Design a protein around this ligand. Structure first.
Ligand code: 58C
Length: 289
């Protein structure tokens, strides 16, 4: 938007890098520390170059505008570490540090690598709330999966890496309308594509991995448009959970419920143990030391 990257402070003495946490949407992400308060913060480092400049301006504008929601990891600020001419400046995107890691981590730190329904129901609702916040502002998340859904040390659920030329990513969370082919040459991301990705995530939570994980990515990409919508393997799960999976995973996107419809789904509303589910989560998080 109206952002000037060269009028940004150097992170020197204001923020510093502690340890690496992982990789994100075009950039590395560190556990950072606020120098004069010792408070933790997530820091995404990106190299500022040709193409990427105006793209950087938009994510910053985006994060400033829409991250003040309780299910969106919050933007703290931005800094440029200016490097010699001819070279790429380093941009530090400073954001709220969700110390419990991703849902993917949660899954692995749970024995058998599956979560309770009550747990899954809580997380999906929170994820949806964040999605509803985004969609209202005409923002598509584009990358919903257990890796981008973070938990805080108070078991709050936050979304990261949203709304941001010839590579193909991992297919397993992609919705049929996103996969370009003969029957569908004009493939673009819809708000309802996020809702499909969420459905996959719910299985990711219920099974430790998404549908078609035991398959070559190119073959999975090929099968997703054609195969019937993925279902829960076991029949152990309640009927409301199975219905919610059916609702999320409607192959034809025109026939797929909108964000607000899924919000009203009984598997989302009927959460009497909400307060309880959160405590179970916070304890399980502490337990990890
Ligand atoms: O998971 C992905 C999520 C997207 C990327 O990093 C983030 C991007 C944006 C903001 C973030 C805030 N807090 C954390 N905190 C945090 C702590 C421990 C983790 N272990 C595994 N991911 C962990 C994320 N990460 C963030 C890369 C990691």
């Amino acid at each position: 938007d109206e952002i000037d990257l060269s009028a940004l402070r150097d992170p020197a003495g204001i923020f510093e890098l502690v340890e690496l946490v992982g990789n994100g949407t075009y950039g590395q992400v560190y556990k950072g520390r606020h120098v004069k308060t010792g408070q933790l913060a997530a820091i995404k480092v990106m190299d500022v170059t040709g193409d990427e400049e105006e793209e950087i301006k938009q994510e910053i504008n985006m994060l400033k505008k829409y991250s003040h929601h309780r299910n969106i990891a919050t933007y703290y600020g931005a800094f440029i570490k200016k490097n010699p001419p001819g070279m790429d400046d380093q941009l530090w995107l400073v954001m709220e540090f969700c110390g419990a890691g991703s849902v993917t981590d949660l899954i692995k730190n749970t024995k058998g690598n599956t979560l309770k329904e009550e747990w899954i129901a809580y997380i999906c609702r929170e994820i949806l709330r964040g999605l509803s916040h985004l969609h209202q502002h005409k923002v598509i998340h584009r990358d919903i999966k257990g890796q981008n859904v973070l938990l805080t040390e108070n078991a709050e659920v936050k979304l990261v890496d949203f709304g941001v030329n010839t590579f193909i990513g991992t297919p397993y969370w992609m919705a049929p309308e996103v996969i370009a082919c003969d029957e569908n040459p004009d493939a673009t991301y819809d708000f309802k594509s996020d809702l499909w990705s969420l459905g996959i995530t719910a299985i990711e939570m219920a099974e430790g991995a998404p549908p078609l994980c035991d398959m070559h990515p190119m073959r999975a990409l090929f099968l997703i448009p054609r195969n019937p919508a993925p279902r829960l393997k076991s029949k152990k799960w309640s009927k409301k959970f199975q219905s919610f999976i059916e609702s999320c995973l409607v192959k034809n996107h025109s026939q797929r419920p909108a964000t607000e419809q899924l919000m009203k789904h009984p598997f989302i509303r009927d959460q009497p143990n909400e307060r309880q589910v959160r405590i179970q989560l916070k304890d399980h998080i502490d337990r990890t030391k």
